[PDB]
Amino acid sequence: SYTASRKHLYVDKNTKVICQGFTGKQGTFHSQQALEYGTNLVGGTTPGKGGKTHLGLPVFNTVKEAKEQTGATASVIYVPPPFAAAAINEAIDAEVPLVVCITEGIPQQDMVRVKHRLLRQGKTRLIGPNCPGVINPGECKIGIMPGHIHKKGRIGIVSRSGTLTYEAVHQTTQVGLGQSLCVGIGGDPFNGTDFTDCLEIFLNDPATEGIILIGEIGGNAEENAAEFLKQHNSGPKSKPVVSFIAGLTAPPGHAGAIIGAKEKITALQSAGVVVSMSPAQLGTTIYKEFEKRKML
């Protein structure tokens, strides 16, 4: 099943990354940041530019070409929206274990078709689209998140929001806890990784002792995450889970209603999640939860 690919979410220093849209404006900037941060970026792809050199790395025409030459196991996509979906497909065809699509603005219909095939295979794991990426602090950085605010630690962070994730990261470093793995699942309705996918990895990662879940109003992703924690996290090896839901003060067809922050907060709490009402207290809340449980 597609859940078999969940494992590929936990990148490490040995992950060899290629950049789809390498010579593009975005790809260049974030590829430099990836190299300076120490990520094993081993090349990229741009149609019609195979053979040239970019940032001291080889450029290829196709993803499969880049994979057999560099043995890449992860791919990051910055292709514009009109062709980003096809870029995900190119990576799945090449059986790239991990694909991270940063691009924002992909038509929902395109991702519905992409996810249709994605769920029928278990070799490739997609993160995104419209997400900041995934980062193993100090070992691997695949995305647009600022690296300097991270520090390898003990808190696994999963966030449905973009830049808001960085607040939870910066705070967990200032309190001295750091982060084991941070995953931004993106803000699009049809994506390759949801909350439960990341929570599964966190609950089975020894390095991850605490968990921070960043959410916001809309949909039922936070509700589903709550149900997942209620059954799998309630137990002796229960790990503390903290969360913040953005849009508490935000103001408010019929098909969507047929098949709301307050409901999210109450649902997460029922599963044992400690919900910080302030976006600036994610680090202090998880820190004191570690203190309550004598985990420091």
Partner: protein, 393 residues
């Protein structure tokens, strides 16, 4: 993006979907000129608002209904005068209502039976899904909650498309019997094909009606369009009136800036919708009321930082601007010069609290503090919020 009823109705007819002949009028006397232009056995008056629930909604004049039915064009001008210009407060509009600038006069048809049908992309259903109920017309959410068994769903395979067996089954569950089953199933197919063609996130027809002559007709339509697909739906997005949005909202969009107005005095300039809401959330926490937030999006260009200040300051209600940029794709020092340059070139009055934490922040803060401008730097989100509520004394 959402279009009015008279705009969605046109798209449906062009793709083989049966809808009512209609005309739109901006005045009450012109609604009488159009009612006579129909040559109709009966005329339907339907207030044009992008919100639903017009049937049992009341205007600010006393008229108890955003939808009326009459047989004489003279009554439309009387009812149209009780619609145009007024706020229509329904179940799904703000308690203040939404100003009704247009009304629809259409060749009214008799409705033997009302059903509900909707096509939308649903995350749980993993792609498109047909949602229908025989208990259509007026409140659909009431029957959906009371009797869930009266809601029928048909998940459509995006690759295979809508199959005959699925359209026939849905049409039968909606209560379409006899020769009307294949006719409805054919309209369901043409609706789904339209749903995919126009890159819609939701196509809702309520009532999916049935006339006494045996004609399956979509009487009302609410089409929601995927904003991400505008690059391949140019003709459709050109139809967006934009009049139901605040003028500043449309002005910010010119520079790729999404604006969300609020009832406060502390303007917010943030990159990321999730962070913008969190910024607003923490302002309330410290007693402040954010006037709005101007989401910047990942793409930062020093031209729009200049504009952003212009739009926020254009609103006199803004007594302070909170800049919170964390983790942008552009160097902070570049945004620092755009802020100063914008301040220098615009003569800023309101106090300015700036929080920058992206790349190369040490230099950026120096550019701001050593500029001689009314700029107080902030360290974290909590600091910027507390400093924003303090500057509104």
């Amino acid at each position: 993006m959402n279009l009015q009823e008279y705009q969605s109705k046109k798209l449906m007819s062009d793709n083989g979907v049966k809808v009512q002949r209609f005309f739109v009028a901006d005045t009450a006397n012109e609604a009488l000129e159009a009612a006579k232009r129909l040559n109709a056995k009966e005329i339907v008056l339907k207030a044009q608002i992008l919100a639903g629930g017009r049937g049992k909604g009341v205007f600010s004049s006393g008229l108890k209904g955003g939808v009326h039915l009459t047989k004489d064009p003279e009554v439309v001008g009387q009812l149209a005068k009780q619609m145009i210009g007024y706020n229509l407060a329904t179940k799904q509009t703000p308690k203040e209502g939404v100003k009704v600038n247009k009304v629809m006069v259409a060749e009214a048809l008799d409705i033997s039976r009302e059903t509900y049908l909707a096509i939308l992309m649903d995350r749980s259903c993993n792609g498109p899904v047909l949602v229908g109920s025989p208990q259509g017309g007026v409140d659909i959410e009431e029957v959906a909650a009371s009797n869930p068994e009266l809601i029928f769903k048909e998940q459509i395979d995006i690759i295979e498309g809508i199959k005959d067996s699925q359209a026939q089954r849905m049409a039968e569950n909606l209560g379409f019997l006899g020769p009307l089953q294949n006719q409805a199933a054919d309209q369901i197919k043409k609706l789904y094909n339209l749903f995919l063609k126009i890159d819609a996130t939701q196509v809702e027809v309520n009532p999916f009606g049935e006339t006494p002559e045996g004609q399956v007709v979509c009487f009302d339509a609410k089409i929601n369009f995927d904003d991400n697909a505008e690059f391949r739906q140019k003709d459709i997005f050109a139809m967006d009136d934009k009049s139901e949005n605040e003028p500043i909202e449309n002005e910010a969009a010119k520079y790729d800036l999404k604006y969300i107005g609020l009832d406060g005095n502390i303007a917010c300039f943030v990159n990321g919708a999730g962070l913008a809401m969190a910024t607003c959330d923490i302002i309330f926490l410290n007693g402040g009321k954010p006037a709005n937030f101007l989401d910047l999006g990942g793409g930062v260009k020093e031209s729009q930082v200049y504009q952003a200040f212009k739009l926020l300051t254009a609103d006199p209600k803004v007594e302070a601007i909170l800049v919170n940029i964390f983790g942008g794709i552009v160097n902070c020092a570049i945004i620092a010069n755009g802020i100063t340059k914008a301040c220098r070139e615009l003569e800023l009055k309101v106090p300015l609290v700036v929080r920058l934490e992206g790349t190369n922040v040490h230099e950026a803060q120096n550019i701001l503090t050593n500029s001689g401008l009314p700029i107080t730097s902030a360290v974290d989100l909590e600091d910027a919020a507390k400093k924003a509520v303090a500057s509104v004394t």
